[PDB]
Amino acid sequence: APKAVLVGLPGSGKSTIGRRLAKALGVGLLDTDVAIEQRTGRSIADIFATDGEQEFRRIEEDVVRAALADHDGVLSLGGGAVTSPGVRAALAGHTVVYLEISAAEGVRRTGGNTVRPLLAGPDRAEKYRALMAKRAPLYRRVATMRVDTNRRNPGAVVRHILSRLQVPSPSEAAT
Ligand SMILES: [Cl-]
């Protein structure tokens, strides 16, 4: 079972924190979005377009269940997995770390390298705030560890998580 399943919105630093965390623990990193493409031979977009959302969500659910069963390291969950009731069921009992950010932090962090994001018009930011309103409540439901990642460096976020994922040395009996 994973040492940690990471969840959060775009902008939360999920990819960089996942890698860093796996590095510090010395464990494997498995990303469910990448795993779906590796198991199907098709892009996320292709599956959506041709089989439809519900079927994408069944395929993802299967992948996530397998990963929770078989992976021992860090599991980075794709952004919409938690909309699936079966995913939220399958997560129960696991260690689930929610990289929590505000709507405003997220907007700022997903603007890219352009210097004047407001000039492209409000639609991208509006769609981002909508997503957060739909996903955030689901992430708070499934979390076992919430981590405030607003204006914190990824290094400090990794330390925070490691301080709360400690494993005692085994007893002589255990050995
Ligand atoms: Cl680190």
CA atoms of 65 and 86, how far apart (whole Å):
9
CA atoms of 98 and 139, how far apart (whole Å):
7
Query: Is 112 annotated for ligand binding?
Result: no
Instruction: Determine the distance separating the centroid of ligand 1 and the alpha carbon of 97, expressed in angstroms.
Output: 16
Q: What is the DSSP letter of 144?
A: S
Please list the residues that pair with 4 across neighbouring strands: 74
**Cβ(86)–Cβ(25) under 8 Å?**
no
Instruction: Determine the distance separating the centroid of ligand 1 and the alpha carbon of 165, expressed in angstroms.
Output: 14
Instruction: Say how many C-beta atoms besides its own lie within 10 A of residue 129's C-beta.
Output: 14
Closest by CA to 110, choosing from 98, 127, 95, is: 127
By the 10 Å C-beta count (0-12 exposed, 13-18 middle, 19+ buried), 33 is classed as: middle
Query: Is 42 annotated for ligand binding?
Result: no
Classify 4 as helix, strand or coil.
strand
Entry resolution (Å): 1.5
CA atoms of 149 and 99, how far apart (whole Å):
6
Dihedral of the alpha carbons of 127, 133, 139, 141, in degrees to the nearest 10: -160
Domain extents for the chain?
A: 1-175
Query: Is 46 annotated for ligand binding?
Result: no
Sheet arrangement for strand 74-76: 29-31, 74-76, 4-7, 96-100, 145-148
H or E element that contains 100: strand 96-100
Q: What is the C-alpha R_g of the chain?
A: 17
Class of 1-175 in CATH: alpha beta
Classify 90 as helix, strand or coil.
helix
Distances (CA, A) of 46 to 31, 40, 89: 18, 10, 27
The residue type at 12: S
CA atoms of 36 and 119, how far apart (whole Å):
36
Query: Is 123 annotated for ligand binding?
Result: no
CA atoms of 17 and 143, how far apart (whole Å):
16
- Give me the residue label for tokens 């079927």: 55
CA atoms of 78 and 12, how far apart (whole Å):
13
- Give me the residue label for tokens 């907007």: 107
Query: Is 152 annotated for ligand binding?
Result: yes
Instruction: Determine the distance separating the centroid of ligand 1 and the alpha carbon of 154, expressed in angstroms.
Output: 7
By the 10 Å C-beta count (0-12 exposed, 13-18 middle, 19+ buried), 159 is classed as: middle
Q: Which residues surround ligand 1, an ion (CB under 5 A)?
A: 20, 155, 158
Pairing of strands 96-100, 145-148: parallel
| 128 phi and psi angles, rounded to 5 deg | -60, -50
Query: Is 43 annotated for ligand binding?
Result: no
C-alpha angle 3-89-103 in degrees, rounded to nearest 5: 75
CA atoms of 119 and 142, how far apart (whole Å):
37
Experiment used for this model: X-ray
